[PDB]
Symmetry: C6
Subunit: 196 residues, 6 copies
């Protein structure tokens, strides 16, 4: 019967949100965790052990894998999902201590609205900034043959990627998820400002 | 003794369903999870490391595995089981907030029936649409010898698959499960419309 | 103190069973799960990576492993243990809803006996049918040298199996478990019919 | 506060045991599980992939590993620990139903002593029978060089084992554990018979 | 309802801290655990099996990997996160016993402030000392080609690293986390001394 | 609210200990488990698959790894941590039954002090005995080149170890932990004897 203290903590955090934002934003978080943790994490398993190059030079497969992939795609999407969830965990931990100082005062407007807007504003800056770095570094597809011009390799060599079509399907799936997540946070910002 | 609040939430969600649909649709969900997570997930383990081709050309096994399998079968069935379960989780989260706004009103018809029909209708569209893509791309069997005509391979080569008979048994098992699941949702749509 | 509602659900399911069938049939289920999940699952680990053949032909080890093993033994025993446990989970979910419709009627013979006999009858049909398929396809032992006559292999080749003696010990262990499980369900059918 | 129903079930099972047998027999069970599950299970990891033989014949390493090891040592000790724990789980499940038929009779000598002696007698028969099979098949040490005379190998070959000294240390550790466990069950049989 | 004894233990430990140090220091601990346990732990997987050298000498890849990496980066960051968390667990276990001796005295200033300052002072000494060892041994980047002059290698050889650019991104991420963590503990020391 | 029966069992076990031994001995147990289970367990992963020797003789790497390492270092430290924790689990299980026989006597000095001293005395004998075996067999460092003179190897060969410097850092970390743990148990023996 000690679960009624959890119903008060969920009510204070979701006090300024709309009725349809509590539903579509929480199920989209579970969609992001299960898809990234089960399906897309194992396609990127043999990303280096199946990368091959057409050369005899020792040391040319180490430096040509590293020029193609400066950071992996599944470790760029894990860093992305933490930065967008930190302003929610920071604001949820802030309400818990505010409700504690006042609970031990009754037994013995304008403050919690400003900190709600700054947390929603930073979840949208982090979503746009991580989409522009990927558009600049990689793009939104993958080709099968790479052409490498590093050292110690002589002139130019041809190198071949591992599963370049299955990975392109999951790059476009994670683009639509982050564009729907960005559009639901802008609706949250518009409803608070245009109300009062 | 705090488990009697769970009996009220299960009663509201299953208010418009028949007596025999609550049984056959929930045990078929557990049948889908245990079969996919234990038996069929490990047959697809060495799908690329045991794919061989009859050539000396460097880079011909990378591009001929990718032409045969644009997406794996076990990652197409994980994406399928999430899309069919999202309209159930969206409707279950909608009833929880509707029962909350009314509970804090009594202590201090036509709305929940329309949203039930749209959730059942989308679980049947997602089952038919995922069956037509697999019929167009793959079929419903697998052969042992593949013939590949990509580049950099010269003319045509012969490539050999890993366990093509054991995988054909599990392709037909997952076809019958999705055809029984589609037939139980059409009976649900017919009982609601022909009642009132 | 909310565990006394579980004692009522266990009493209704086991109302038509004998006194000694509640003990010997539940410990035999745990014996089947722990033996299959710990001991026999890891002997079948390198079943393909240690299969060798005496040839130089590319593609002859792929097609001669697949002719020998159309389905693995540990994935045939996982499919077997689900089919025999589905009529128990279907009948246990049926009693839970029958006790719910009557509980909300008292606060605001001939039906549950017919569905008990049909569930016990289907656990014995599924045990006999899975034993006859294995007797027809495989047998109840394994030999060390296999002789293969598929294509692209020339004439006939010799192929060698991985651990053929340790696997034969566990084939006979899982045969005696399914013959004791079949004999305890026939005693259950004989006691219900010859009582009344 | 619903944990006081567990204190009654533990008191009925341990009613005929001595004061010092409840302590030394339960901690020795945890010693057997943690040692077998953590330390000895990973020494037997590369038991086949590091077995080598001094030959060029294809198929001679498959048949000479199998002649040396008809069953592995870590899968013979998992089968041993289940057979000795089954008479304890069968007797513990028997007391739970006997206390149930009598509890629903008071709210609406000579029987449980005979079944206690038969369960202790079978834990000692299973400990002696598993020690005599290992003395006949293997012994209680391991040598480094094996000499194999099977087919298709020509005449006799030399084969070399993986970690034969570290495995000999753990064979003697599991011998002393099963000899102390056998001696504590004979003291239990002597105290019940010589009391009354 | 037995969770109200946890609210008293959390209040005594955080009695001398500021209002904004309870929030920013606890979420930064979770940021350190999830980033180190999911993203950076798997980039360091094939650190030795993909290290290559341009030589034919047997034994030159063993001694040139060991000269480059005297201790791995992911095992130096696990040792770092335990040493900084030990003074928090030592002080939290000290308050629990102090509240116990006084609770069994009421039912049948200057002591807990000195031990709080010494625990905060040791979390800052351990953060600075682990940053100076890494600056002396490694630096804060990684290059792609290493030049090795050990024995048995003849003269000098060239050796090539595995993913030297992706690892450099995560070295700088874990530097900023430990510099923000060091700056939040110095603010804690300044607020206690300048208050009273 | 059923957690107040755990506060009585913890009070009886720690009745003869000092105030500062309850803190420093329990956090040092958690330091031993997390360090051994996370950091040092994975450095010893490729201990045999990266051991190389400068020979062409078949069977010389099997017998020269086994002469160098008669038992691994991480399996000698798991056996060590169980033997030192068995006298604590034996004494904790002894107090639980002594408090049971007396609880069912009140509702329907000199005994528990002798058994406390014998349990502390055996935790110090097991710590000294495991340190002397390692000093005799191995030492407290590891060198990079080993010289082997077994059979079937001709004359003498050179063999090379895997990570001999990172392992030497963790050998000295586990030496200081067992010397601090031995010094805290001797202080416990001195305080009981010199009190009364
Ligand atoms: C009675 C309130 C229960 C609170 C449960 C939710 C925890 C909120 C996050 C953790 C805050 C405290 C960290 C120590
Ligand atoms: C009165 C009930 C309080 C609200 C409980 C909500 C539970 C949220 C935490 C568990 C979420 C796990 C996914 C469903
Ligand atoms: C019984 C309901 C379970 C709902 C699905 C949860 C699946 C979690 C799997 C995550 C780990 C995947 C490992 C392959
Ligand atoms: C060596 C050439 C310059 C490196 C370019 C790659 C930079 C990638 C930056 C990715 C940062 C992602 C986390 C913010
Ligand atoms: C490769 C496995 C992916 C697992 C995803 C982990 C993401 C964790 C999200 C945590 C959200 C809270 C951040 C403070
Ligand atoms: C001051 C406590 C409440 C904080 C509200 C959330 C603020 C969001 C800050 C996000 C900054 C992210 C930096 C990594
Ligand atoms: C090389 C051809 C690649 C074809 C890309 C197909 C991508 C389909 C992804 C579907 C995304 C829709 C999300 C709702
Ligand atoms: C090769 C790149 C193809 C990109 C096509 C997909 C663009 C996404 C448009 C739909 C986004 C939906 C936002 C709500
Ligand atoms: C008292 C009601 C308990 C509700 C438990 C079921 C949770 C329903 C899904 C989670 C909804 C709340 C998400 C924060
Ligand atoms: C009054 C009881 C409420 C209904 C409880 C149903 C439990 C459903 C959640 C757990 C399902 C796990 C598989 C059985
Ligand atoms: C490069 C040739 C065209 C690619 C054909 C493969 C398309 C596969 C589409 C699978 C989509 C499955 C998720 C909807
Ligand atoms: C390869 C392991 C398969 C595990 C299956 C995971 C499926 C998860 C289903 C989740 C249903 C809820 C979706 C919102
Ligand atoms: C509005 C809240 C209730 C939603 C009911 C379920 C609607 C189903 C929508 C499914 C759309 C799936 C898109 C991926
Ligand atoms: C190459 C021959 C393949 C034979 C296919 C056999 C498929 C049997 C599957 C049984 C499915 C029945 C589900 C109830
Ligand atoms: C090679 C493809 C063979 C397909 C045969 C199986 C067809 C499935 C018919 C039975 C479906 C049952 C639906 C209830
Ligand atoms: C009060 C009754 C508790 C029932 C617990 C056992 C659950 C029975 C199986 C699950 C049936 C409900 C599925 C949603
Ligand atoms: C009154 C007690 C109800 C019966 C409880 C039986 C528990 C069965 C579920 C847990 C089984 C786990 C293996 C012992
Ligand atoms: C403490 C009682 C435990 C009883 C034995 C349970 C062992 C479960 C092991 C199953 C996983 C095996 C992984 C090797
Ligand atoms: C290609 C030759 C015919 C295939 C024979 C193998 C059939 C195996 C059927 C196994 C079915 C097991 C699940 C019912
Ligand atoms: C290879 C691991 C074996 C694990 C056995 C899993 C068997 C699951 C049995 C589930 C019984 C209920 C079926 C509806
Ligand atoms: C109608 C609800 C009760 C069902 C009782 C059990 C019937 C057993 C049916 C088994 C059929 C198995 C088909 C896969
Ligand atoms: C090639 C010789 C194989 C010998 C077979 C031995 C099988 C013993 C199995 C014991 C089964 C008894 C179950 C109680
Ligand atoms: C090579 C096959 C040998 C089979 C011998 C074992 C036959 C099993 C007879 C005993 C079964 C016990 C049933 C209760
Ligand atoms: C109130 C009694 C609780 C019993 C808990 C111990 C369970 C005993 C073993 C399981 C017996 C019931 C199996 C369904
Ligand atoms: C009155 C207390 C009943 C006895 C509780 C004993 C617990 C035994 C089950 C848990 C054992 C786990 C290892 C300690
Ligand atoms: C915190 C007390 C834990 C007691 C030791 C339990 C260790 C269990 C480890 C079993 C799995 C081993 C995997 C390497
Ligand atoms: C093929 C030569 C005869 C086989 C001898 C090996 C028999 C091993 C029997 C082990 C049985 C252990 C489980 C009872
Ligand atoms: C290789 C992992 C070893 C794990 C040991 C599992 C032993 C399970 C013992 C179960 C005792 C109850 C038997 C009915
Ligand atoms: C009849 C219910 C009580 C059983 C008491 C324990 C008897 C022990 C029988 C052990 C037989 C083991 C055969 C595998
Ligand atoms: C080849 C030399 C092997 C030496 C065997 C040493 C065995 C020591 C085992 C100690 C067992 C004692 C258990 C208490
Ligand atoms: C090579 C075999 C050596 C066996 C020596 C060990 C014999 C065990 C004697 C001590 C047993 C202790 C029983 C309580
Ligand atoms: C009633 C107080 C509950 C305390 C829970 C927190 C435990 C504090 C750390 C453990 C201290 C005791 C170690 C045996
Ligand atoms: C009155 C509530 C006491 C405070 C509860 C705080 C819970 C902290 C322990 C669990 C933390 C897990 C991460 C949220
Ligand atoms: C053999 C040459 C001297 C070794 C230099 C490497 C010393 C690394 C010390 C790292 C200590 C980190 C834990 C404190
Ligand atoms: C490689 C996996 C990393 C997991 C991190 C473990 C860190 C444990 C921190 C424990 C803090 C308490 C120390 C006493
Ligand atoms: C005396 C009990 C309270 C201790 C307070 C914390 C003191 C911090 C000591 C840290 C020393 C770290 C040595 C490894
Ligand atoms: C070889 C070029 C490496 C480029 C380094 C880029 C490092 C970016 C790390 C961003 C750290 C910011 C933390 C907030
Ligand atoms: C090659 C090394 C580059 C280091 C540049 C980063 C220095 C970090 C400065 C910002 C630290 C923020 C502390 C709050
Ligand atoms: C009411 C007392 C609860 C006891 C919990 C601690 C268990 C002590 C170790 C287990 C002893 C009983 C083993 C069956
Ligand atoms: C009155 C509170 C009793 C003492 C509780 C101590 C808990 C010890 C067991 C859990 C330890 C886990 C590591 C903190
Ligand atoms: C074959 C040469 C004699 C063997 C010497 C190695 C003995 C190692 C004994 C280690 C015992 C550790 C557990 C007590
Ligand atoms: C390799 C993983 C190490 C895990 C350590 C397990 C140690 C278990 C300690 C158990 C203490 C109780 C012994 C009776
Ligand atoms: C008699 C019950 C209390 C036992 C107290 C602890 C005695 C310590 C005995 C340790 C012996 C270790 C032998 C492996
Ligand atoms: C070959 C040179 C090895 C250098 C050894 C350095 C060991 C440092 C270990 C620090 C241990 C201190 C524990 C507090
Ligand atoms: C090569 C061996 C070097 C050993 C040096 C370390 C000796 C440990 C002395 C400090 C021990 C601290 C005990 C409290």
């Amino acid at each position: 019967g000690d679960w009624s203290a959890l119903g008060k903590l969920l009510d204070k955090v979701q006090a300024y949100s709309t009725a349809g934002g509590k539903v579509w934003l929480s199920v989209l978080f579970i969609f992001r965790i299960l898809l990234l943790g089960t399906a897309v994490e194992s396609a990127w398993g043999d990303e280096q052990s199946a990368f091959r190059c057409n050369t005899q030079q020792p040391g040319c497969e180490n430096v040509c894998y590293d020029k193609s992939f400066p950071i992996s795609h599944v470790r760029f999407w894990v860093l992305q999902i933490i930065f967008v969830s930190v302003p929610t965990l920071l604001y949820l931990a802030h309400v818990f201590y505010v409700m504690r100082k006042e609970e031990k005062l009754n037994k013995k407007r304008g403050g919690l609205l400003r900190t709600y807007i700054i947390s929603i504003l930073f979840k949208s800056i982090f979503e746009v900034a991580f989409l522009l770095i990927q558009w600049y570094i990689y793009g939104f597809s993958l080709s099968a043959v790479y052409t490498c011009k590093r050292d110690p390799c002589p002139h130019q060599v041809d190198c071949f990627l591992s599963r370049p079509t299955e990975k392109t399907i999951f790059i476009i799936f994670m683009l639509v998820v982050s564009l729907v997540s960005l559009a639901l946070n802008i609706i949250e910002l518009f409803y608070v400002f245009f109300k009062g």
